[PDB]
């Protein structure tokens, strides 16, 4: 048995406590959140087809206190529907509470709450950028392996109302048809190259004509003309992605054909950025809600 | 081509929590031997324990030991 309502209540009760207060879930409760959410992820498409109204959120990176603040502003589930774009863990103080609340809400509201995979939701990255160490401190390495099985089953992209393409990183020179996303089978790792890598790792660059090299040591950059051609080919209006710190929490690219969202304010106490979420209403009006107070980009190959 | 979405011209702003967000950076504290041991650990985990669908086994990311 998973007492899901007890877990959620305990996760939410620290909202009135000192910042950074941990939540005392058991190992078996956390394993239950991973196993039941994994089953739900596998039962839904890898390319989600979603309908507004929806609130779309970017990286969180274990800033649990800020996640609670974001839910307070946007409305706690199920008052609003949510889509998160990945990067739930690593590079913050409370990855465990963050991912546990997200997974609990996925289980409780499986048709109203959605999580995509970011590049930190894979073993080779979150082994070193903090999540493995956090799991080891609080629980054990076996629990990190259980989270990895759950992360290996996350969906990769979403299309909202046939008009907003959502993913963590960005476009891929290998992405010619949406069927190529749908054909990816789970559980899977994130490869060091190819379509699934690029969806989680690539970045827009205004100075690139076409595709370029990415200084993270993996994947590509892509220019405004790539965005325009992709939207035209697929009859889409917007790419919504995350994966980069931006000062206002949101930042447009390519004459508002792409937006980057980033939802962790004052990222890891080193940057002066806001965190934002984008609300899409039933008429497809998009609006922003901001929580306002390089070295920030994660890289591949740190082990090599 | 006809565009359906539109953007509001007004953003809502609220004050973020005021607390110390600084976190540990364990990836800056890896000796060469530590890195070799982690590459080995990840390879053994992915080759012996981590479930991957048959059609995705070509995506599994191994590290040069
Ligand atoms: Mn990130
Ligand atoms: Mn990222």
User: How close A256 gets to chain B, by Cα (Å)?
Assistant: 9
Experimental method: X-ray
What Rg, from alpha-carbon coordinates, does chain A have? Answer: 18
Apex A147 CA angle, A194 and B19, nearest 5: 100
Token representation of residue A159: 């299309």
How many Cβ pairs closer than 8 A exist between chain A and B? 168
CB contact under 8 A, B60 and A189: yes
Which residues are close to ligand 1, an ion, with C-beta < 5 A? A 59, 87
Q: Using CB atoms and an 8 Å cut-off, which of residues 209-248 of chain A contact chain B?
A: 232, 235, 237-238, 248
Token representation of residue A27: 């190992």
- Write down all domains in chain A, each with its CATH number in brackets: 4-291 (3.60.21.10)
Among the partner-chain residues B4, B51, B63, the one whose CB lies closest to the CB of A149 is B51
Apex A182 CA angle, A108 and A242, nearest 5: 65
User: How close A194 gets to chain B, by Cα (Å)?
Assistant: 9
**How many A from CA of B19 to the centre of ligand 1?**
20
Which residue pairs from A99-105 have beta carbons closer than 8 angstroms and sit at least 24 positions apart in sequence? A99/A147, A100/A7, A100/A11, A100/A23, A100/A25, A100/A30, A100/A33, A101/A8, A101/A11, A101/A12, A101/A64, A101/A67, A102/A67, A103/A33, A103/A34, A103/A37, A103/A150, A104/A4, A104/A7, A104/A8, A104/A11, A104/A33, A105/A8, A105/A77
**Cβ contacts of A65 on chain B, cutoff 8 Å:** 17, 19
**Where do the structural domains in chain B lie, given as residue ranges?**
29-59
Among the partner-chain residues A192, A268, A290, the one whose CB lies closest to the CB of B23 is A268
């Amino acid at each position: 048995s998973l007492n899901l309502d007890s877990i959620i209540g305990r996760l939410l009760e620290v909202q009135g406590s000192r910042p950074g207060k941990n939540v005392q879930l058991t190992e078996n409760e956390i394993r239950g959140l991973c196993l039941k959410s994994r089953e739900i992820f596998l039962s839904q498409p890898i390319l989600l087809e979603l309908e507004a109204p929806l609130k779309i959120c970017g990286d969180i990176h274990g800033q649990y206190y800020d996640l609670l603040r974001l839910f307070e502003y946007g409305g706690f589930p199920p008052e609003s529907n949510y889509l998160f774009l990945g990067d739930y863990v690593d590079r913050g103080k409370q990855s465990l509470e963050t991912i546990c609340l997200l997974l609990a809400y996925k289980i409780k509201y499986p048709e109203n709450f959605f999580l995509l995979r970011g590049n930190h939701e894979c073993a080779s990255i979150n082994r070193i950028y903090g999540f493995y160490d956090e799991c080891k401190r609080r629980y054990n390495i076996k629990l990190w392996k259980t989270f990895t099985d759950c992360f290996n089953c996350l969906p990769i992209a979403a299309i909202v109302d046939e008009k907003i393409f959502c993913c963590h990183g960005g476009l891929s020179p290998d992405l010619q048809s949406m069927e190529q996303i749908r054909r990816i089978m789970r559980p899977t790792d994130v490869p060091d190259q190819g379509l699934l890598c690029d969806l989680l790792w690539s970045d827009p660059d205004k100075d690139v004509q076409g595709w370029g090299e990415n200084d993270r040591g993996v994947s590509f950059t892509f220019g405004a003309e790539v965005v325009a051609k992709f939207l035209h080919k697929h009859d889409l209006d917007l790419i919504c992605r995350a994966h980069q710190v931006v000062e206002d929490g949101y930042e447009f690219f390519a004459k508002r054909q792409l937006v980057t969202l980033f939802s962790a304010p004052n990222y890891c106490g080193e940057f002066d950025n806001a965190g934002a979420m984008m609300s899409v209403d039933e008429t497809l009006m998009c609006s922003f809600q901001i929580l306002k107070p390089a070295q920030s980009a994660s890289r591949e190959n740190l082990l090599e | 081509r006809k565009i359906l979405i539109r953007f509001s011209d007004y953003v809502e702003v609220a004050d973020a929590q005021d607390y110390d967000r600084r976190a540990d950076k364990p990836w800056t504290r890896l000796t060469a031997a530590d890195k070799a041991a982690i590459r080995k650990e990840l390879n053994e985990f992915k080759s012996t324990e981590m479930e991957v669908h048959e059609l995705s086994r070509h995506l599994t990311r191994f590290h040069r030991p």
